[model samples]
Target: GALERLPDGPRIHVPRKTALRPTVARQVFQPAFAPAVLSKFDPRTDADVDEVAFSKHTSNQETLPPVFRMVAREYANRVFALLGRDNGRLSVKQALDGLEGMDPMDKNTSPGLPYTTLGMRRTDVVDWETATLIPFAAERLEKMNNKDFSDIVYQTFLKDELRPIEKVQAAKTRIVDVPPFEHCILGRQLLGKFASKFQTQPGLELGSAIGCDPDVHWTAFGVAMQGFERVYDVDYSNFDSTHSVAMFRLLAEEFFSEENGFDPLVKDYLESLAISKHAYEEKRYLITGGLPSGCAATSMLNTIMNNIIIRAGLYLTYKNFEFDDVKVLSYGDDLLVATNYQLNFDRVRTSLAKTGYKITPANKTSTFPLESTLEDVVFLKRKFKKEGPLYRPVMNREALEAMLSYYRPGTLSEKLTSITMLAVHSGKQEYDRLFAPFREVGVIVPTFESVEYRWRSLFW
Candidate 1:
């Protein structure tokens, strides 16, 4: 019956372990690299490309190739030269003089301003206690084993890449400092924003949304995962360095250029940091992975690049299939495509392969059902039940405690208020259950009692 109601199209189903392995050949997607004609503009050609010139060369380069550093140096030189030019000739002192007037802190300045600003460190420091505690809390709440706890901590926090020289120096120089970016928070926010936007847009079909997680998905592309490497790893030697640079330039010019956009400074700053890195592994190896997983820019870049590649493939598929209504949405590597015709679905897979994009064979999908009426729905934190057209909220104590233990009190408080407002209005029992432990642990004060009351009443 479920199959009968399901749309008659290609479907992606999760595979079972211990099952007979299919002999399907692996598909390879080649990365588009910069062309030979642009070799003249290459930054490495300049004799001035040295670490002394770009002191901010403190990025973790072990994740990239030596070529990326050249690109950054070249771009930086070009920008500085443009800034310093008096009628036409290059003058370092003149550039410095002109730079004095440019305030990176000024919101009115060009988005590219921060890219040249000094003193902002790009590396993140792990809060060891916070990192260790979350898994400890999860284990306690979920009754997980020691191995599970260790795996969670290792995968999420303990397993870190080599820190940039600047980051290490900053930590040693100051007792306390914050990282320029927090990848997790920024990534979650970006996903929510993009997914919500896609949900609202008309004529867009989201079939099966699958996330191609960093380490797991990238390996399928036939890229090597050397020592301590993960999926989506950006190897300097394996990936096209020029293509990466071109993509960054295109994004900056199209979306963040001073003459055409808002907050170009942010994009410029991110690109500058991302591309600049110190040479690692006896100068033979560099940071050769996709953007660092913890940076916000990594998520944005992933979304943009993956979206472009998938769309390009889809266009080819459209040409082949003659499909009229096809829609696609992606967040980072998570991809979703919707089409009325089965032929279009097949074409999408074929086109994606041709464009050097690989879908995890098991992740492909088409037979997803939409509920006309809410029966039982669960989102990240909130659970829901249907009451005709209206859905009622249901809270779980374990889940709530897990949230409280894992997240900061302020974050948990906001989440509670938001979820409670959408539920069948909270009773005193719900209030007591939710707030009792938090109060006992001194996580909340009596002052929040009124705030809770106000939130509940506002919804009612």
Candidate 2:
């Protein structure tokens, strides 16, 4: 069963040991050393410059993380070798040079081949979180000699087959492409000038491989809550139970009806939501966080839900709509949220459309934002980092280990952050026994535990 209800919201204390080193002082772009920074590490200063830039023919330069750059370089070499370039003896560096020089824009530098190939899409920037799987997929493609090289590369590395990385498809022809709201539920904030609840702060990108960054949490949690409800149906149990429903009714009357201290919209929405049978049914559900394929389904659910809530909330707030009694619920194949008797689908759809968000079915089972921009799906990958004892047997060590290897530590700090994030996210509150082993590992002990694991292990 999936965990439907939110675990008694843990304070989510992170380990002190997971503290990261301060960001490397931002170096002003020196024209003199720009080329070096653009290419390889100089090795003279403390600066680590093993990096590559993926930029469109006409846009700002965005960098690929060092690990991804290295892997892309290697993949480029393999592709060239397959093409019989230089009798297939070319080094990775040579292949990168060839690709860089071939065409700054096209992924396919070497032309005149029977097939059409473009170089890595400049818009397809990768970070430490999702790039770790590049090598794993590349090695397999090379070994298998798959005919559909590109598809194989993505399938093996990027798909839910390996991990849950967001597959973002950018707008090509449309002057104003609307991103679907369901995709927002994935917890990723939309990019560009779209009206969204979540936005990257002035300088900070939403998901920049920084550990314990709180900026992305609300978005992530919203989606996680959505997934919890979708999969387990227990997330809203409190709202559905007679006790909770009566409590809300009493509160609404006390605050909104007679006192008028609160917005009537809040009371109306809360009362309507309290009587929703769909919400009640969902409250009894539970998800083990163990899906048949992988946790990818759960991750996708969480990511999409997070994105939707953030965008929807912002959209409502921007329109001067009363959001005090907002209650988002998934019904059959569609999701519905209430704000004072506005239960009509078209009405909700129109509101979202006004904000540049369009929700459509991603597949038969899930819905996603179309033409959406994702800062990173790394948070989803990080969330499932290490499976716990309860999660094992159901999800083995090999799968978790593969995930860890796929997202190798770029820096010691990132590595520790990944560990800490996984520790907190993976601990299932529904199962009291799930957290026993983590206490020894020095993760924050939540209050949900009936008895702390003082004697669970010799080390403890």
Candidate 3:
């Protein structure tokens, strides 16, 4: 049943090509203006006048790319019209309330009253405040009813969303003013459900886990690796935006459409707010940033898309290679598939490429030998190689330091004890130098007759 359904491959869609001209250049340099005259204005003439003139010229020249400008203009106009309909006085509450019943049949409509209302929940309503509404209710509304103003809001939202999190060594961190116990219970339950599903899959072996650091860029470009590499050189910072509005609109419809069980409100929000721009080479360019990573809807959509792409690839491999059994498990961009055949591997690789997925070369491996096992280690943990019939536990400085930073001494000691037991079982000699750092840190070590015990207790 799964095999038959697998044939219904994902429908690939490219964004529509819109006029990508510079909006300000067109507005300022209309046919009536002479470039020679404009160019003749010297910056060295008068400091005040020159600065003012230069500012004016650069401001106009720095307008957003055509598609972004167009979308922003449309969004602004719709917002303005909605406000006007309410006699030029609409609070976020009133606006959101009005949006609740605007339209459900037409999915591509502007995110005016109808768009905002689709996913509006009681909690979201209760969270509203006048401080948030004042911007829309005040003179700010007049400023926002245009392309330039709309672009500012869009970019600001994007920047805030993309703000980097502090790099902490811990696996989990406490949040202020939040119930930690509730989150912990919910997180554990979610993990348990996922773990059960993952552990139950037949023929699932830890082969090679291939991943792209940030898979969103790959998704936006239809997963074209070569295309991504090529465009990255031109503008790596905002390369994700190359996807046109039409392309994104089609992708949204195909991937997040109602039939796929995507929330209608989320779908509309994504589609309406698809277009974004970034400054590069002193000019603004239109780009589609894809789904925001932090959004709950985005995580759900990513999981769905990844399954489709990964499963489709596996199906191709199974059919083409006539394999006895094939299984795949994916977490975001990282994929673990059970396969030892190079032919089957090649087939899966090609199939994934066809579906716009790339396997990072360095992360790919099939043979699970002791030497090759180094790659499998995660979270500053390492696996000891099998020597004869013995397997020792080992940890380098980097891993030890990382562990120390993330875990308390008691936790680290417990882990070390477990690792030492494995090493003792393997009858391997202890790495004295490796355990020296832990000993110096006053971490308690279990006494054993093996070399590990001697090394760990050297300074004790």
Candidate 4:
């Protein structure tokens, strides 16, 4: 009776109770983000012109850290052959296997290969496919020799699969694209443990120690790209992530090896992505900026590349400039520079700019004393402040409240799911006092063990 009164159009599995678990109440739910009523977001788009002028097509090797010169694309051929036991060289086969490579895997939705019947979904800003997996022509595989080539082809054929939609003002109100399920599969299958989140409390402690660069500061200059609606913003741009020359160089020389190899076929697939062309609304278009808001591989790659840029910068700082106290903890494009030294910070920023990074100066702040060495302390979805001598996560109640709307207009389950997430994200003020009204419906929000810090180290 209670469930029947819930709204329609979540398109969820209907309920019934039994052994297949006879329609049990939902324990969890993720809302489909598109429909008008759930979000009512704008699907229109536009160009962001700043990075187009700020970013460079290529890095100036002379301006970069020395380690970068050793590892740049020009030196790639020699490094790939230098790591054997005798320090002799690698054979062509050994070089191809990626014996020492790293990768990671996982789940969920958004775009590619129109796979729906006629009676369903399409629009100027969206093309929804909800049926069979679009089959590929056998001829493309007829003469292909590599067995694993199919895995590459299988994912590549759906290459154009990405759905960009406006996110609710609640969730920072930016454009977020939904990637294809198979692409998610391919990301994990190809990247495995390489995709692990590396930010942690240890990183925080690294900066807070006395005599070290003890202040944790944030670097939040944004560089993500929207989809086709803004594709004309360029013939296209290459802040590096879009074309990925830097990533390919890093992956091939750093993480890849014979044990968990990045074979020839994988290299070719990545090459295709760099030059990727897409079809949307019956027209061909290309992305002219970084990441293009899809492809989870590039998502992971961004973190790796950003981290390495700082790593290279720090190496130069320590060896050349004599600074030993800089530490950068990175998760995605967000970097937390735990520093007090001016030289280390400037060098890192310099390296980033020279290597095609761009920043939004308008978005920065220095709540604690404005110096050239100012700080933006909030990070990783939690607000942080100094509790006298130490720091801890504090709620950004306003932003949290804004984010809540994405899960509104929910079901018994949606309503229920929202509170559970709220339970996990807040203090007693939120869980016990604020949501007490839920008791009228006999809702018992469980005491959830917060899992936000579970960088369980299965594979970092």
> How well is each residue in 157-192 modelled by candidate 3, as lDDT tens digits?
111011102211111111111111111122122222
RMSD of each: 22.8, 26.8, 21.4, 14.4
Of 3 and 4, the candidate ahead on TM-score is: 4
Candidate with top TM-score is 4
Of the two candidates 2 and 4, the one with more favorable lDDT, higher being better, is 4
Model 4: per-residue lDDT, tens digit, 178-236?
33334333333344333221122223322211111112321111111111011000010
Q: Which portions of model 3 show Cα errors greater than 4 Å?
A: 1-251, 260-262, 272-274, 278-285, 289-292, 295-300, 314-326, 338-343, 361-460
lDDT (Cα, 0-100) at 70 in candidate 3 = 34
Once fitted onto the true fold, the runs of candidate 1 whose alpha carbons sit more than 4 angstroms away are: 1-274, 278-285, 293-303, 316-401, 405-460
The number of the candidate with the highest lDDT is 4
Better of 1 and 2 by lDDT: 1
Kindly report which residue stretches of model 4 are placed more than 4 angstroms away from their true locations once superposed: 1-111, 116-186, 193-247, 257-261, 292-296, 312-325, 339-351, 360-376, 384-392, 406-426, 430-460
What TM-score does structure 3 among the candidates reach? 0.33
lDDT per residue, candidate 1, 1-460, as tens digits? 0001112322211111111111111011111211111111234233221222223222222222333233334332432233332212112222212223221112221111111123222211222223222343333323322112111110111111122234322221111111122222222222232223222331112211233221222222111111211111111111112124444554455433443312323343335323432221122112222243332234345544544444455456555532224333344555433334333334555554443344432222332233211122222223333334333344544444333333332355575554343332344565555556555656553343564566435335
State which candidate, 1 or 3, has the greater lDDT. Answer: 1
